RNA sequence: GAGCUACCUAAAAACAAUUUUAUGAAUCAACUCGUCUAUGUGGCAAAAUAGUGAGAAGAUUUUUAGGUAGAGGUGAAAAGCCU
């Protein structure tokens, strides 16, 4: 009966594993958006080349 | 290389011989120290009686710490614990060689290892047949009070009610400023003071065009020999050779101190009652109680004080 | 097994012999006078002989707000309010003019310091001088009183909300808005509790000390 | 510890203090070579435009062990001749006042409670 | 504060050639018995240590290849085996790292 | 005056000191042999010793888990501490870490360096300082003295 | 020589949230300015930094191009500004 902590990468570190974990954080804010406008707004709000 | 090289006691010893040498060196400490336990049966020097104006030897002790203490009047006295530890008489000079009117006895306490010491010090002790001691000190002793070298000294050499003087090196404070070294006021915090808060003010006057010798300036504070005068002895523990001395003693805990009868005017010839040459336990004239107290002291295990 | 705190040595470079010498003296006084078991927050009545009179006795009853000291110099503070005037006396357990110590009410409180009771309402500080002792159960654990006191206006003796005090006995919700509680958390040092070289483990020392105390009996 | 300009609580029943006034009394002088004032030390108050002598009977600063620390700086008013201005003191007074060098028997007589 | 006078080479030569400012000769330099290279008495040999770390890097490279990714540290003991060696009974149930080279003489 | 203080001042401050030591400890647990500056390795050695003590307490201990969680930033190491390192050091009462000084860093800062490792690891053995043999001239004379002393009472 | 700065012409921009109202109104960002103190004083800087402050839908601020030239220009006059 030992509650080992989940083996996941840190959220704040400066690595590739930690970046891919901050990507799922915003991606989850789309999953959890009720309306389709919010989903499309989140997916397109940030402009890049 | 055909040049100087460094060595220490452990460099060439094997794993087994490392333990063997440690046990051997400690073995020698045991036998040597038990040889000198009986001064009076080893050709003791003649024991002269006390005459007025005599000064007897003192002891070197280690500073254990402090504790509270109470008197039958209910007052609380902070007291310091001094342990007499491997204290032996080491060297004797006569009045002529010391160049003083009085003679000198060098005592030493707190036996130490033999492994990082100069050959000179080790030879000095090998002649005397003692393990090396941490520190030497010199005591001024009159001719009647001379004691043969190699004679151990014990806390019972002092008795409750006598006043004593302790000298030891003070705690070092490193390089310090002028406020903490000499208690200078300093300068204001605000109202326009620019980069001058803890600084010394004007060194001197404009006329003399120099700084007087002995002007107080920033420097290294502490680590100096200081002495405290007129400290009462409240109690002596004969089993552990502990002396209870009123008030504070210079130095840190585990610091070696020099204990000798007080030189203040009041207690000029108080050593009449005390063992004049020294306290000999080998004589065994009467066996001392484990704890010696001063009459005013309220001993623990006594009934609670009721100022009826 | 309740080992009185004063027996536990503080860490440092002082010799163990200095402690052994003191313990023997401490045990000697305890035989003459019995020092009851008590904790911070328990109410005590201490009868001491006054030195300003002819051995006449004085009595003071209060809650033990603080316990501190090692060896024969250990002390405990206890507060009360008399005719609407708070007073605190810092008694010395081994002072030879303490005639008797009676634990009127034995209990434990959420914190081991109750200095904040200076800023709490007077009710939490006032205790009846004439109150009779309450029963105790030896083969039981001491009760832990979980009372959370109510404070008077914010200007306090100290900043009890700050994380260094770690007070768990004050109703911070009533007296402080969440904005203040958030701001006060800017003085929090989360690493302190998790650095292993700052913890002084006394289990072995307590075990050896407990055996010696019983052996002397 | 009471100093110059400290704020004090008169613990008599005398009219000079008893009467509620928007300003408390403030210490103007401490009768010592040391500027600090402790239990049993006289001080000169400025109370309602009047300069009046007084005696400290308690303070918030810690003292030696086995003495009582109060929550307020308590003071009693004494006349120029030294007789207390007020006739009663209902607040506890420490018993150390008896043995301190000085004249405190008059104040002790007026005090019913001692701590 | 600025200099009132230029400082002479004779004054400067005393300051910067004072013994306090000279390089102190070292008495703690000795030879390593195995390699015959120089070392200080209280520090490890920098040549023998260099052998160990180069082998250590090779082993750590092999460990990474076996794991294949981050956060794959085993919960069981590890052991290193060289060509011509097979796990013993005591070696059962322990991660095994295999090295192409023969067992080094120092490594035991 | 810094008499009696048992810590070095490292990093940007007190919190920065812990995090710097925490990363070194995390590396030591994963790799079991680490190179760092002598001062930093000396500072981290104490935490390396105590961490193993917490592992010995056991997996089910909650205080050990919280402490292990804080210090090991990579959470895969938590099973390693409780199930690999702690079982290894069951017999010992202490002295789990071996720390030695290696030549100065050849990087223009000439830092004083040290290699810190846990005892019993799988890596190639370090070239430790080995004492002389009993067959040497000085040792034999000491060995000769030992035999006589024991045999003759 | 008006790519700085003073003033002007033409063509363009920016001002969230909150309360008032219907505003050279209010609180306060972005933005504009530079009150007080400390640091700095061959400095990060030939006028800055860090705090603290004033204005912040207007006589506001900003961008681009053009104009006025030394016996002169510009000036909500400080004999200010015109690299
Ligand atoms: Mg000052
Ligand atoms: Mg300043
Ligand atoms: Mg002159
Ligand atoms: Mg205060
Ligand atoms: Mg010269
Ligand atoms: Mg220092
Ligand atoms: Mg140090
Ligand atoms: Mg223009
Ligand atoms: Mg707006
Ligand atoms: Mg406006
Ligand atoms: Mg404003
Ligand atoms: Mg305004
Ligand atoms: Mg203008
Ligand atoms: Mg004008
Ligand atoms: Mg110009
Ligand atoms: Zn080598």
Swiss-Prot record, chain B:
Keyword Ribonucleoprotein: yes
GO molecular function: structural constituent of ribosome
Annotated localization: Mitochondrion
GO terms (BP aspect): mitochondrial translation; translation
Pfam families (UniProt xref): Ribosomal_L3 (PF00297)
Keyword Ribosomal protein: yes
Domain of life: Eukaryota
Cellular component per GO, a single term: mitochondrial inner membrane
Keywords: Mitochondrion, Ribonucleoprotein, Ribosomal protein, Transit peptide
Quaternary structure and partners: Component of the mitochondrial ribosome large subunit (39S) which comprises a 16S rRNA and about 50 distinct proteins.
Family statement: Belongs to the universal ribosomal protein uL3 family.
Protein name: Large ribosomal subunit protein uL3m
Swiss-Prot record, chain D:
A single Gene Ontology CC term: mitochondrion
Gene Ontology terms describing biological process: mitochondrial translation
GO molecular function: structural constituent of ribosome
Sorted UniProt keywords: Mitochondrion, Ribonucleoprotein, Ribosomal protein, Transit peptide
Quaternary structure, from the entry: Component of the mitochondrial ribosome large subunit (39S) which comprises a 16S rRNA and about 50 distinct proteins. Interacts with MALSU1.
Function: May form part of 2 intersubunit bridges in the assembled ribosome. Upon binding to MALSU1, intersubunit bridge formation is blocked, preventing ribosome formation and repressing translation.
Family: Belongs to the universal ribosomal protein uL14 family.
Protein's UniProt name: Large ribosomal subunit protein uL14m
Curated annotation (Swiss-Prot), chain E:
Species the sequence originates in: Mus musculus
GO biological process: one example: mitochondrial translation
Mod. after translation: MRPL32 precursor is processed by the m-AAA protease (composed of AFG3L2 and SPG7), which cleaves the N-terminal transit peptide. Cleavage by the m-AAA protease takes place prior to assembly into the large subunit, an essential step for mitochondrial ribosome (mitoribosome) assembly. Proper processing by the m-AAA protease is dependent on the zinc-binding region within the tightly folded C-terminal domain of MRPL32: zinc-dependent folding halts degradation initiated from the N-terminus and triggers the release of mature MRPL32.
Isomerase is among the record's keywords: no
Keyword list, A-Z: Metal-binding, Mitochondrion, Ribonucleoprotein, Ribosomal protein, Transit peptide, Zinc
Family: Belongs to the bacterial ribosomal protein bL32 family.
Main location: mitochondrion
GO cellular component terms attached to this protein's record: cytosol; mitochondrial inner membrane; mitochondrial large ribosomal subunit; mitochondrion
Chain's role: Component of the mitochondrial large ribosomal subunit (mt-LSU). The mitochondrial ribosome (mitoribosome) is a large ribonucleoprotein complex responsible for the synthesis of proteins inside mitochondria.
UniProt subcellular location: Mitochondrion
Binding, Zn(2+): 32, 35, 45, 48
Entry's transmembrane regions: none
Subunit field text: Component of the mitochondrial ribosome large subunit (39S) which comprises a 16S rRNA and about 50 distinct proteins.
GO molecular function, one term: structural constituent of ribosome
Protein name as it appears in the record: Large ribosomal subunit protein bL32m
Curated annotation (Swiss-Prot), chain F:
InterPro entries for this protein: Ribosomal_bL17, Ribosomal_bL17_sf
Record-level GO BP terms: mitochondrial genome maintenance; mitochondrial translation; translation
Pfam families per record: Ribosomal_L17
Keyword terms: Mitochondrion, Ribonucleoprotein, Ribosomal protein, Transit peptide
Superkingdom, taxonomy of origin: Eukaryota
Compartmental location: Mitochondrion
GO molecular function terms noted in the UniProt entry: protein domain specific binding; structural constituent of ribosome
Broad class of where this protein is predominantly found: mitochondrion
Entry similarity comment: Belongs to the bacterial ribosomal protein bL17 family.
NCBIfam families: L17
UniProt-recorded name of the protein: Large ribosomal subunit protein bL17m
UniProt source species: Mus musculus (Mouse)
Gene: Mrpl17
